[PDB]
Amino acid sequence: APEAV
Amino acid sequence: MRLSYEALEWRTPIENSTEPVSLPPPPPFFGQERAREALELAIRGGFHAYLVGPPSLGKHEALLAYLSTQSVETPPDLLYVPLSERKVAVLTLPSGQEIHLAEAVEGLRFPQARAYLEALRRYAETGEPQWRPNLLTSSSSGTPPPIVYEPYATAPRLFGRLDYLVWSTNVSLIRPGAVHRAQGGYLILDALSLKREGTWEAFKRALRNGQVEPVTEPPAGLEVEPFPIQMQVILVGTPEAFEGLEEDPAFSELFRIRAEFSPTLPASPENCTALGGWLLAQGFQLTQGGLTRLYDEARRMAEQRDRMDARLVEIRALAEEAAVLGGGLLTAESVEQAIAAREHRSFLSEEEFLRAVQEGVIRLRTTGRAVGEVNSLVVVEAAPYWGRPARLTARAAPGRDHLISIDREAGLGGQIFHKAVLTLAGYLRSRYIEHGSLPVTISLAFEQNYVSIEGDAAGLAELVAALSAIGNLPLRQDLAVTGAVDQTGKVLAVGAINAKVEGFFRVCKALGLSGTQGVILPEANLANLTLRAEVLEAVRAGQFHIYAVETAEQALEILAGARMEGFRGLQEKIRAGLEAFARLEEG
Numbered sequence: 001a002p003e004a005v
Numbered sequence: 006m007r008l009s010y011e012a013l014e015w016r017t018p019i020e021n022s023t024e025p026v027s028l029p030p031p032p033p034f035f036g037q038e039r040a041r042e043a044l045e046l047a048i049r050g051g052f053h054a055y056l057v058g059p060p061s062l063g064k065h066e067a068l069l070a071y072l073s074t075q076s077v078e079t080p081p082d083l084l085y086v087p088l089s090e091r092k093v094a095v096l097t098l099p100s101g102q103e104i105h106l107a108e109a110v111e112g113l114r115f116p117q118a119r120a121y122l123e124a125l126r127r128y129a130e131t132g133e134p135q136w137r138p139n140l141l142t143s144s145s146s147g148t149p150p151p152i153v154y155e156p157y158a159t160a161p162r163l164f165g166r167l168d169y170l171v172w173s174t175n176v177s178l179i180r181p182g183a184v185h186r187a188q189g190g191y192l193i194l195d196a197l198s199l200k201r202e203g204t205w206e207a208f209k210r211a212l213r214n215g216q217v218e219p220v221t222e223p224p225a226g227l228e229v230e231p232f233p234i235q236m237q238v239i240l241v242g243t244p245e246a247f248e249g250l251e252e253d254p255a256f257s258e259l260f261r262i263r264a265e266f267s268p269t270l271p272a273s274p275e276n277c278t279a280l281g282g283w284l285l286a287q288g289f290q291l292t293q294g295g296l297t298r299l300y301d302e303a304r305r306m307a308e309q310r311d312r313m314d315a316r317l318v319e320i321r322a323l324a325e326e327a328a329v330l331g332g333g334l335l336t337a338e339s340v341e342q343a344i345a346a347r348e349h350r351s352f353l354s355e356e357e358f359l360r361a362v363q364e365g366v367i368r369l370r371t372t373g374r375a376v377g378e379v380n381s382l383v384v385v386e387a388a389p390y391w392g393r394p395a396r397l398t399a400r401a402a403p404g405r406d407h408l409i410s411i412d413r414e415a416g417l418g419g420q421i422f423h424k425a426v427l428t429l430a431g432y433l434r435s436r437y438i439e440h441g442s443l444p445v446t447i448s449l450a451f452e453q454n455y456v457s458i459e460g461d462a463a464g465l466a467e468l469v470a471a472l473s474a475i476g477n478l479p480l481r482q483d484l485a486v487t488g489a490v491d492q493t494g495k496v497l498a499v500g501a502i503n504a505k506v507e508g509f510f511r512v513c514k515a516l517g518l519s520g521t522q523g524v525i526l527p528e529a530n531l532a533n534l535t536l537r538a539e540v541l542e543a544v545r546a547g548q549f550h551i552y553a554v555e556t557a558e559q560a561l562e563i564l565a566g567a568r569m570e571g572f573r574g575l576q577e578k579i580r581a582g583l584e585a586f587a588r589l590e591e592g
Contacts, residue, residue: 001387003395003454004501005422005462005487 006528006553010545015310015535016301017277022294022337030286031279033071036270036315041071043264047237048075053212053259055196055240057247058266063317064241065193069152072191077147080189085139086121087176088230095217095232096121096138097188103140110137135175141185151190155183158198160207165219172224179219179227184211187236196242200249209255212238269312272304276313283317284335289324294337299324302344305535308503323347341538351389358393359515367453369396370482371512372519377401377474379564380485381451381466382505382524383458392501392508394485396452397463399470401582403589404446406434408471411450412458419459428461429468431492432557437583444587447471462499464490465525468557469564475586476579480564483522484552485509494557498529503536510540510549518543523550525560 034041040056047054056064081097088094098106098117106115115122118138127133144151155162165182167174183192199205210216215231240247240260250256270276280303281296299320306314314320323343324335330346331339361367369380371394380394410426412418418426426449434443449467451458465488473480487505489497499505506524513522531553536544543549554560558569569576 001385002457002459003383003385005381005383005395005458005460005499 008531008534008544008551008553010541012531013534013536013541013544013551015304016538016541017297019294019297019337022292022297024293026281026285026291026293026296028278028282028285030282033067033074035279035283036276037067037266040264040266043262044068044071044239047239047262047264050262051237052262053238053240054262054264055242055247055260056264056266057242057244059243059268059316061316061318061322062266062268064266065154066317068193068239068241069154072152073149075148075150077150077189079147080142080144080151082143083141083181083185083188085141085176085179086118087136088120088124089228090135090175091225092228092230093176093179094120094230095141095185097235100143100145103138103143107138107140135177137177139176139179141181142188147189151187152193153183153187153190154193156195156198158194158202158204158208160202160204161220163204163208164211164217167219167221167226169222169224174227176227179229182217182219184217184234184236187238189235190237192236192238194238194240196240196246196250199240200246205250205253209259212259213255266315268315269307269309270315272300272307272309272311272313280313280320284321284324287321287324289328289335290333291335292337295327295331295335295340298337298340299327299335301535302340305503305537308501308533308535310532310535348389354385354387355391355393355511359512362512363515369394369512369516371516371522373482374479375482376477376479377470378482379466379470379473379480380482380509381463382485382487382509383463384501384504384508390501390504392504392506394509394512395454395463397449397466397470398452399447399449399467399474401445401447401471401474401586403444403586405590406442406444407446408433409446409448410467411448412454417451417454417457419457421461422459422463425461425464425489426467428492429464429471429490432468432490432494433471435492436494437580439580440583440587444583444590445475447474460500461489461497462487464488465496465527465557465560468494469561472557472561472575472579473565476575476582478561478565478575478578481566483513483519484525484550484564485523486525486560486564488525488527488554488557488560490557496527496529496554496556496560498527498533502526502530502533506534506551507537507540510543513549518548520548521550522548523552525552525554525563528553528555 079100082103085093166180168178277300303313327339327343330342377399381397383395384392408430466486568574
């Protein structure tokens, strides 16, 4: 999965 | 500023945990004043309305309960009468009066039913060998009013159907639809169903022109006259479900009253108390400690100390799992263990991650010091949104004022990520001007990042890493960093602050707690910190530490273990690195 900072 | 355990504690003290709760049920729409007042206006005016709010709020249940208490004049008899052998009209008589006009007919005083009879006049005139009225509905009181919720908005369910008696049909094979059952009352539909079923346009025609046509099959049909629709329609959906609809100017014309739910309520004793009576009314056996934990989990779900999640259905669902773990009883323990077991059921990914870190397959530091490196914090974008540390490096070399985001250049970073890098560049160029443009090229990398990354919440970690690389300043690796930065070097709020803090604690714990570990975060996020028990206890034990800052330099001070001024402070070291870089670049 993509990540948020 | 250091945040003490006392500053961080947010949970409600429990007195007499196992005592049974006894409270009356709150009214429909408690804490949702805006939406209730909108709906009262729609009821008072006869306007159509739409109920808008995120999923799992209980919008449908609140609406059915509120409508259940209303009163209207008893709805008329409703029927199809023929005007011909290929034509029908929809007719209301005053209530009950259908059965009399039917029996009079069943032979071979009704001013409303004029055209039906007139036209009911030549079997005798030609031996000419399908004619009696068709009652769609009737009822004995408009209290409660008719309330028809049709979740599946297909043409036949909305408008009714023609059956075919072999092929023939007539007035008496026409079945009613939701629109017919809702006359003198309320029809409730979901916005999403209207879109997906392709029925929005036919539904408009029903409300704008009274065209309500039973569904047929592609032999020979009856013509159905328009009729004056008497109903109030209430659509239900999310903000997003409505945006398709709101680009049609007809939507606004037909649906004038917005009834919008807040996703959160004030965290107040009154709302706790209301939650309790609501849970009791749903059939739960609730203890004080059980109510308290559910209320506090609602605050944590909202990520706000002073608000609570308003999603009654999500709260009920957690309660249902708690009730099983408490053997039918909803206790403090049962809720804490329902929450823990949710995390366990979704933990495989973090267990793999932590194992990879322990094995050195993912290289992370949680102790010691290093130049130009820092743990920032990220959130994995799949439910339930676990936070993790991410190692970030910055390297400085003599060059021509370039700040290079390697993740962004490689296509992994998104627009807001890119924006944060540009913003830091703007801070740094304008902050250190003595050499003209900056005599450094600085490259930033999220070291073991293989996925796309987005957001501005690594800005603080990037800026401190950069300053550290410029000044050759060893930074503590036992403190992770999260925060956005503006062009002036102030630190701004970030999202998912609980998951981020807890994610670094989880890695520190898996690698063995050193007693000096922690997180530097924005002061602006103080009101979002609703940390889980385990982190709170570690902070109370002096085993974990939270720092809140307002500026990037404050963060650097903590990480490098010195002040910017009192020179021998960091600022002169930074200026000295820049002078060294400028000599290598120039002379």
